[PDB]
Design a protein around this ligand. Sequence first.
Ligand code: QZC
Ligand code: QZC
Ligand code: CL
Lengths: 305, 301
Amino acid sequence: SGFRKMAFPSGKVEGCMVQVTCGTTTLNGLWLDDVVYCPRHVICTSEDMLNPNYEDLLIRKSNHNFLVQAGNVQLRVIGHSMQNCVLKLKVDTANPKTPKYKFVRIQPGQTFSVLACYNGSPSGVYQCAMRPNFTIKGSFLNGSCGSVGFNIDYDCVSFCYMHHMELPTGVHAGTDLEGNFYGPFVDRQTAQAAGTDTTITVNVLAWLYAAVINGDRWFLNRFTTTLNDFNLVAMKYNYEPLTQDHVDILGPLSAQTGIAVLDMCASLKELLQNGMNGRTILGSALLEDEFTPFDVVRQCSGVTF
Amino acid sequence: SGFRKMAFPSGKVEGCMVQVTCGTTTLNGLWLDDVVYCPRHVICTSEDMLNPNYEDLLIRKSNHNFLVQAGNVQLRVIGHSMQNCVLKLKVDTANPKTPKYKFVRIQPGQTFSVLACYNGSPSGVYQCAMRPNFTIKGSFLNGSCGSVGFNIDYDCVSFCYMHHMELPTGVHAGTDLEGNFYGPFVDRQTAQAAGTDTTITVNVLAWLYAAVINGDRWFLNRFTTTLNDFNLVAMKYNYEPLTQDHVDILGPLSAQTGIAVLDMCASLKELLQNGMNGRTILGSALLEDEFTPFDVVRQCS
Ligand SMILES: CN(C)S(=O)(=O)N1Cc2ccc(Cl)cc2[C@H](C(=O)Nc2cncc3ccccc23)C1
Ligand SMILES: CN(C)S(=O)(=O)N1Cc2ccc(Cl)cc2[C@H](C(=O)Nc2cncc3ccccc23)C1
Ligand SMILES: [Cl-]
């Protein structure tokens, strides 16, 4: 029993975090084999961030301009190259703690763990979701740039996010590990804003099934709905459209609890139109959308890494 | 900006998780130097749990009855002893991954990270608080016994909790790393129940100061309160009494934001009276009590 927002164990990622300094800027880097990955804005200064030509700023830097620190040991940079918005620093030493890994690009709604770091030192780990507007509601301060997002599947670490910046609403923007931004964001000091956000419907449904598994049934009803009727209701409440793929993905949870996906949708419709009426679901007065169907299955089954 | 429930990086603890097997029972152990710590109920045969005599069950055991597995390597047990509700298995290999550590006993209201494990394999990490009723609202399944709670301030891991059991309300009970239970609980399957739980007042106040630091001020008011009038109101909402120690502890946050502790207490009084009125504080529709004053300073500053 119990349902917590749970992160993956961060150990395999902790062994890869390094400090990257270039000029007056210090941020975090990911050391995998003999390459250190970090945001390319590490080469930028005060005037530079306003309108930066990164190829021009990069051609002016030499290997020794980049200071890489792994714990109390300085790594020597022997090469440098740019791939989209990520800088790749070739180092002389391969990381002996390099885990089995992949670089993966996630879709909005998918969740991941973030190992927040400052000066190449991990300070905390939290779980979060890629919002439908491509931002993450994270917890970051200055010097957190280069912190990474990941999932673990068996013994393989899938790196899916690298932190680049904070937007004026307090939300965060970043890239996959190939340097491609999530969302319509650019790595520069300019007027940018997150678009109107929506609720991740398949995730709320998964969390309602987690509540049923933990013994919370007050919200269930005798009713069912159609996918078409529910999608009209969901669109009215800034909820993401629920697709047939979402319905299929929820199949295992529907079989385990005996509540058809469109039966749980009729519960969700009633919650959206009437509220909770002073009640909570899993200790929450709001409908939680940062647990995927797979996160619910993993936590309510005990999968280990 | 942003305020999340944050756990400590679990790496230093992952390198200590082992599987402990005695007969048909398998649970988790903490391998530090040449000792493996685990709940002493690993020697019980289910029926034993109603009225176990641990001294009588342990005297019947030898070193080779305990199977310890660290990854794919079996450790050899060379000694065994009981300290309160913890079994200490002396092993022939010191853990090369032993971090700098301490055993600390925490007070209710204190927070910590839990590395939930099954078969000596870590599956997840989450942030918890010791409830005023000495239970923890964790997320644990069968086989999670022996999972540990910790804080990592600087490079030193302070182990403060070891999981032992789930109570009938779904909440969890356990011990410090010296085997002393938190609360009036016993490692026995007798009728036990968590006492009425209360809200950790000093933690809610700390979280209201975190909201002010992040720019949320809608809940503040022009009022102040005496400490006594605040506690008379707080007790009616099942909130823990706020002590002078709590007021002193909140001093730094009061100085940083310019809002006196008793002024912040008046806002809390009003929030308990009025509810949120469709608003949120730091993305929450409920008053959060699992962030200490120290956690707020650590994350916001
Ligand atoms: C107005 N800015 C927030 S700034 O500090 O001047 N800024 C400009 C900027 C522009 C472009 C890019 Cl790609 C990066 C960045 C950096 C940036 O977003 N860093 C930060 C990241 N995360 C949390 C932060 C929390 C407080 C401050 C910075 C934070 C730095
Ligand atoms: C009635 N029981 C809950 S039981 O499963 O029979 N039980 C009896 C018991 C009594 C005393 C002690 Cl010290 C331990 C234990 C064990 C026990 O609490 N383990 C478990 C621990 N944590 C989460 C669990 C989540 C589901 C199941 C067990 C869980 C086993
Ligand atoms: Cl304490």
